[PDB]
Amino acid sequence: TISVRVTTMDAELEFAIQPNTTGKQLFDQVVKTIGLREVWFFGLQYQDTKGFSTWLKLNKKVTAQDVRKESPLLFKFRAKFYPEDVSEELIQDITQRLFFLQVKEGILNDDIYCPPETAVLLASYAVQSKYGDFNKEVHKSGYLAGDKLLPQRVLEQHKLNKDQWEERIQVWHEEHRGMLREDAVLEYLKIAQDLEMYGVNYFSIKNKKGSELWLGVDALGLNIYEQNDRLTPKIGFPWSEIRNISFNDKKFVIKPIDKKAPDFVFYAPRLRINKRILALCMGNHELYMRRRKPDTIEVQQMKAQAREEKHQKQMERAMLENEK
């Protein structure tokens, strides 16, 4: 039997599996352990035998995928898909917290572009989540001096020092007094989800002519970007307009729903990456159609459980808040 370590954005988990264990059986233990039921967004990422970041396929034996000759096997539990609207679609506090931490990681390392003024508001919600209500006795000058709060490109391209950035974040921290940490997490996600790069998987492609471009795959559809501008799509293909996505030997074809419009063609060189593109397209299209049908009874019951858990946590805080 095989020892496994799974890291979420804020937890270490240890498991032992049979060598016959599928992805789905390992994944099911992870989500049961952390109490996550919104499982459709998530997957297990690992570094393969060549050092490439790889999604574990749930419908295959773990040890048959290109996992390393390590012990224990290491995985990262991460969101693979994003909702169109966090308010509507992230039901559980755990789901909200794991999206929050994964997105904030990508904001702070400059993976997800964020203008300075937005970075300050995001940081103010991250502070409310970490520290709770501002109190001028504890949150003295320097209270944020030890925190990674802004993207490096925001800290670089300005001549404000550490102290001036902390003062700007504090103004908004003070404004969030009375906000539950979980409500700050949600307000963070509501701002982040409107960023141009939020929830976009980028891939390096060419058109027929050989112009170097980017493909974006996201919740809403496909986008084509100029090489030097990953913020503004030059062309958009909503999932509602895509009949089929396929590739054969570097050549991708996007067939439209309107059978009289032409196909869109692009080229991507790596078989490994082309499979990953196809999997994100099929996964994003399936969730696009699913969120346009009515909530399953299962989802209604998760919504109920979440609302009751939230009501219960309020009662407990009411009881403690009262004692003194």
* Residue spans of beta strands (DSSP E) within 151-239: 201-206, 212-217, 221-226, 235-238
Which residue blocks in the chain are alpha helix, DSSP H?
Answer: 23-34, 86-89, 93-108, 116-131, 152-156, 162-175, 181-192, 271-290, 297-323
User: Is the Cβ–Cβ distance between 85 and 193 less than 8 Å?
Assistant: yes
> Are 9 and 67 contacting, i.e. CB atoms less than 8 angstroms apart?
no
Residue pair 58/64 in contact (Cβ under 8 Å)? The answer is: no
Q: How far is CA 121 from CA 11, 55, 157, in A?
A: 26, 33, 18
This PDB structure is determined at a resolution in Å of 1.7
* CA 254/CA 245 separation, integer angstroms: 5
Contact 267, 251 (CB under 8 A): yes
- Tokens 């895509």 sit on residue: 242
Give the method of determination. Answer: X-ray
Residues 6+ apart with CB under 8 A from 200: 216, 217, 218, 223, 230
Distance of alpha carbon 47 from alpha carbon 68, whole angstroms: 7
Contact 87, 138 (CB under 8 A): no
What DSSP element (H or E) covers 173?
A: helix 162-175
Distance between CA atoms of residues 62 and 127, nearest Å: 39
Q: Which helix (H) or strand (E) holds 6?
A: strand 2-7
10 token code pair:
């804020």
d(CA 187, CA 180): 11
- CB-based contacts of 56, cutoff 8 Å, min separation 6: 23, 26, 27, 43, 44, 45, 46, 62, 65, 75
Place of tokens 């925001």: 154
Q: How far apart are CA 220 and CA 239, in angstroms?
A: 6
Number of residues written out for the chain: 324
Instruction: Phi first, then psi: give them for residue 34, nearest 5 degrees.
Output: -90, -5
Paired sense of beta strands 73-79 and 2-7, if any: parallel
Give the integer Cα–Cα distance in Å for 276 and 282: 10
Whether the Cβ atoms of residue 151 and residue 119 lie closer than 8 Å to each other: yes
Residue 239 has which token pair? 């999932």
Q: Tell me: cis bond preceding 72? Omega within 30 of 0 counts.
A: yes
| Residue 88: burial class (beta carbons within 10 Å; 0-12, 13-18, 19+) | exposed
